[PDB]
Design an enzyme around this catalytic site. Structure first.
Site, PDB file in Angstrom:
ATOM      1  N   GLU A 297       8.082  -5.585  -1.432  1.00 50.11           N
ATOM      2  CA  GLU A 297       7.031  -4.584  -1.284  1.00 50.11           C
ATOM      3  C   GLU A 297       7.554  -3.208  -1.686  1.00 50.11           C
ATOM      4  OE1 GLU A 297       4.435  -6.090  -1.268  1.00 50.11           O
ATOM      5  OE2 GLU A 297       4.904  -7.955  -0.180  1.00 50.11           O
TER       6      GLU A 297
ATOM      7  N   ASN B 170       0.865  -1.190   0.000  1.00 50.48           N
ATOM      8  CA  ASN B 170       0.000   0.000   0.000  1.00 50.48           C
ATOM      9  C   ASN B 170       0.891   1.227   0.000  1.00 50.48           C
ATOM     10  OD1 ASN B 170      -2.400  -1.780   0.774  1.00 50.48           O
ATOM     11  ND2 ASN B 170      -1.113  -1.896   2.648  1.00 50.48           N
TER      12      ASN B 170
END
Ligand code: NA
Ligand code: NA
Ligand code: NA
Ligand code: NA
Ligand code: NA
Ligand code: NA
Ligand code: NA
Ligand code: NA
Ligand code: NA
Ligand code: NA
Ligand code: NA
Ligand code: NA
Ligand code: NA
Ligand code: NA
Ligand code: NA
Ligand SMILES: [Zn+2]
Length: 866
Positions: free
Chosen positions: A294, A261
């Site tokens: 990530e 995110n």
């Protein structure tokens, strides 16, 4: 539940450009207010169709007018009669405490956190929950200050305030338009590790790692790896971070590994928390990998996202490729490549031969959460690596540059990425695109001929892909087939033809073709499919001596390892057949001698030696066979370990002792030595009982780090040594309060060769450290039993299948995503013998009839029972 199809993609009738969210946060009842600025792109009479799941709608306004022209339908809010541009305001309620599926907004211990990928944001409000809708988010969070002192969302803080009755609020803004799958919110009470990174161009980035209170002692390695990741992405790919703060939150309850995110990554604690007494070397390197992964998504996924979910590998194949390249550059490239190949051949090949087979870009999906697969990820990355092989580094980076120049700020497709690579490099990738559309593992057959009269060597290479349940038609691929030719002294023979050099990457593009090499003055030994240059099964009629020769002479460390694998495969197959006839292990003396030589070779990197001395797993062994006999495989693996332990006893002990290290360091040379020492320990554990027991027990008690302690404990279990029960109890008593550390112990229990393993596993459902509410605990006990102990799972009495059915009956309702991971071993039934198939089918039929069967399980069960 209805399949969706890639060929049905159509641009949305409406876009949303900006969304202002307010959360009045409470675990029992959260109130969400969402104000979206929308624009109609389709026909004037088309309604706005919003996705939504389990939401309590309170109100719907359009430009502040309470709206009447709407209807709720299954999974949707359908809003009619709209202007071309308008402000939509939705108020709705959700219940985080009821969210056992861990999709949307849920509770992790006392924290509240989100998981939006793939389609979780629609569990929070009614939205265009599709990744080609990119909007600028602002997020206001209101909550109890004592319970939730940290209120986090994507981007930077723009406003803050305090209210009556102990509540406070923080508002966040992220300037980069994003699909809603990249939204995140976190609320809770944390310890925070704070650091900084300054980018190459001088942008200062605040780094913040949030962990549960009392876990700061376990944070510095993840922070280090974050900074390592940022530096590497600058050095290798020329990419810098684009925001002011980089937040990572470690949560204990998480289905998906970790999540990119924007500016607010949420990670399973397993891939953050480490210290030397709690985490192994492999844990350290997995933290490193996942932190990198990530981070790498910031560009390959966030700055350029996916047009639709069938393009998932656009970000996942590419980002797995990046994480491999990161690991490989910082650490041992050979060990990384070896282990990624082990995954491909053992685990991914099995999927590609299963009822769930799909191309890396799927055509049909029922539940998109079922497609976060070994295929999309690991095979995806092999496909990106093939592009890198075909182009070379410089051209590949030119293609990366063109991809970002074209697609920065947009949602793109797999095809767009290939086109960038093709256009920047001038390499034709038209045929290569078939790798995106075709499922199944190609089989590449090679025959050779040496003509001493002409001094020519000819390779005749064939390909085929067997049909898969999803595709009846298959065609030849563009297979980059790397070779090297060795003379009888071990020197490389220059590849040439008709007076010109020939590239060592052969383009194998046809069903059958020949390659002729000139000026080959000695009959060669070939190294074939070098560094696993295409994700294919190789069929070449190797002699044992060619393989032992490569083990001694091959230039790339991978090829030495691969040769050892090919040599062992012959004898694994031999001995499984023998096992089925009641006959004991047979192994030529010359094969044992090849492994003795690896032990005694002073010039070999210990990292490489350790991998050559690590036998293929039972999963890798299974893929050598058409019909899997899991008991034979498990028993032959054990017998081979025992035979080598006997034949190489003195050498194994000598190398074990030579690699002793008194200091523990998380450093790659040290890691390599320890992996070699513990590889020797595995065999030594299977020596004379008295010697083995003393050696293993002493390592467990004298260990100064968890790598060494766990290696000893695992060997006590695998060899059923006298000391096993005492060491297992000691570990439980020391570590029961620490779930991540107990996961290692649940795995050893679940994978134990003991005859009563299932009874023990069932009893461990009541263990003080186990809970059905935690995906890590499920995975480590139940998952490890089903997936990693196929001999027990496939017990002849069918007890393993019955146990899984009971667990799945719970998890289908509690957490379908975890359920769907766990059903995988049952959907492989066609690989087993008829009697096992019959029991597995009966189990699947039982699950098929569950009340409230999840779509997740439905998709898999229907494919399996077809
Ligand atoms: Na706004
Ligand atoms: Na609805
Ligand atoms: Na938009
Ligand atoms: Na992404
Ligand atoms: Na390296
Ligand atoms: Na779905
Ligand atoms: Na779902
Ligand atoms: Na082309
Ligand atoms: Na030949
Ligand atoms: Na040959
Ligand atoms: Na062969
Ligand atoms: Na397998
Ligand atoms: Na044996
Ligand atoms: Na418990
Ligand atoms: Na398995
Ligand atoms: Zn990813």
């Amino acid at each position: 539940p209805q399949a969706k199809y890639r060929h049905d993609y159509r641009a949305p009738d409406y876009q949303i450009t900006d969304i202002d969210l307010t959360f009045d946060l409470d675990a029992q009842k959260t109130v969400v207010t969402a104000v979206s600025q929308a624009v109609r792109h389709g026909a004037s009479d088309a309604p706005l169709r919003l996705n939504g799941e389990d939401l309590k709608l309170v109100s719907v306004h359009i430009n502040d007018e309470p709206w009447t022209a709407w209807k709720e339908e299954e999974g949707a809010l359908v809003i009619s009669n709209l202007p071309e541009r308008f402000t939509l305001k939705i108020i709705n309620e959700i219940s985080p405490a009821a969210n056992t599926a861990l999709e949307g907004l849920y509770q992790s211990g006392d924290a509240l956190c989100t998981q939006c990928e793939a389609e979780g944001f629609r569990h929070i409000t009614y939205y265009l929950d599709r990744p080609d809708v990119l909007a600028r988010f602002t997020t206001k969070i209101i909550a109890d200050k004592i319970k939730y002192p940290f209120l986090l969302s994507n981007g930077n803080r723009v406003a803050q305030g305090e209210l009556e009755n102990g509540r406070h609020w923080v508002q966040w803004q992220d300037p980069f338009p994003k699909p809603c799958y990249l939204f995140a919110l976190v609320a809770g009470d944390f310890d925070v590790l704070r650091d900084t990174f300054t980018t190459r161009s001088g942008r200062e980035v605040a780094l913040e790692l949030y962990v549960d209170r009392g876990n700061l002692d376990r944070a510095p390695w993840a922070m280090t790896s974050l900074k390592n990741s940022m530096k590497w992405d600058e050095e290798r790919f020329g990419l810098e971070y684009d925001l002011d703060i980089y937040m990572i939150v470690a949560v204990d309850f998480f289905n998906m590994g970790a999540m990119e995110n924007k500016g607010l990554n949420i990670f399973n604690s397993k891939y953050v928390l480490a210290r030397t007494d709690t985490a192994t070397d492999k844990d350290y390197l997995d933290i490193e990998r996942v932190i990198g992964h990530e981070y790498f998504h910031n560009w390959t996924g966030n700055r350029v996202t996916c047009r639709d979910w069938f393009q998932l590998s656009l970000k996942e194949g590419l980002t797995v490729f990046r994480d491999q390249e990161f690991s490989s550059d910082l650490g041992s490239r050979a060990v990384n490549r070896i282990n990624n190949v082990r995954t491909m051949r053992g685990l991914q090949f099995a999927e590609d031969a299963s009822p769930m087979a799909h191309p890396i870009r799927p055509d049909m999906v029922i539940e998109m959460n079922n497609f976060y697969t070994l295929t999309v990820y690991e095979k995806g990355a092999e496909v990106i690596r093939m592009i890198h092989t075909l182009l070379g580094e410089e051209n590949f980076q030119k293609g990366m540059q063109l991809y970002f120049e074209r697609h920065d700020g947009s949602a793109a497709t797999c095809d767009d990425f290939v086109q960038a690579m093709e256009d920047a490099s001038n390499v034709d990738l038209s045929h290569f695109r078939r790798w995106y559309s075709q499922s199944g593992t190609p089989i590449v057959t090679v025959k050779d001929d040496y003509n001493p009269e002409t001094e020519q060597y000819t390779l005749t290479i064939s390909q085929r892909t067997p049909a898969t349940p999803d595709q009846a038609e298959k065609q030849p691929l563009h297979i980059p087939f790397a070779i090297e030719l060795y003379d009888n002294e071990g020197k490389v023979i220059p590849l040439q033809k008709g007076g010109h050099p020939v590239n060592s990457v052969l383009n194998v593009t046809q069903a059958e073709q020949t390659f002729v090499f000139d000026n080959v003055y000695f009959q060669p030994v070939p190294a074939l499919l070098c560094e696993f240059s295409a994700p294919v099964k190789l069929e070449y009629k190797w002699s044992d001596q060619q393989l032992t020769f490569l083990m001694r002479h091959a230039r790339n460390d991978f090829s030495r390892w691969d040769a050892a694998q090919s040599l062992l495969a012959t004898y694994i197959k031999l001995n499984v057949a023998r096992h089925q006839q009641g006959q004991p292990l047979s192994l030529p003396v010359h094969v044992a001698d090849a492994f003795r030589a690896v032990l005694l070779d002073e010039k070999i990197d210990p990292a490489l030696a350790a991998e050559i001395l690590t036998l293929p797993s039972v999963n890798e062994m299974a893929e050598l066979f058409d019909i899997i006999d899991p008991i034979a495989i498990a028993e032959v693996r054990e017998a081979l370990t025992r035979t080598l332990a006997t034949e190489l006893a003195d050498e194994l002990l000598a190398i074990y002792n030579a690699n002793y290290q008194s200091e523990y360091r998380v450093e790659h040379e040290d890691i390599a030595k320890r992996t070699l020492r513990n590889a020797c320990l595995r065999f030594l554990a299977f020596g004379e009982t008295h010697l083995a027991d003393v050696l293993v027990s002493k390592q467990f008690h004298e260990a100064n780090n968890m790598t060494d302690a766990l290696a000893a404990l695992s060997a006590a279990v695998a060899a059923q040594l006298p000391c096993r029960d005492a060491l297992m109890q000691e570990y439980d008593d020391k570590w029961h309060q620490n779930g991540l550390v107990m996961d290692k112990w649940f795995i050893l229990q679940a994978t134990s060769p003991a005859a009563n393993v299932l009874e023990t596993v069932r009893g461990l459902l009541q263990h003080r450290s186990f809970t059905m509410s935690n995906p890590n605990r499920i995975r480590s006990l139940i998952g490890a039993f089903a997936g990693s102990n196929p001999a027990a799972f496939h017990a002849e009495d069918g007890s393993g299948y019955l146990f899984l059915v009971e667990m799945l009956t719970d998890l289908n309702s509690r957490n379908p995503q975890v359920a769907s991971r766990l059903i995988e071993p049952l959907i492989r039934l066609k690989r087993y013998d008829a009697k096992r198939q019959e029991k597995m089918r009966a189990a699947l039929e039982q699950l098929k009839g569950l009340e409230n069967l999840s779509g997740d399980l439905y998709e898999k069960i229907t494919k399996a029972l077809a």
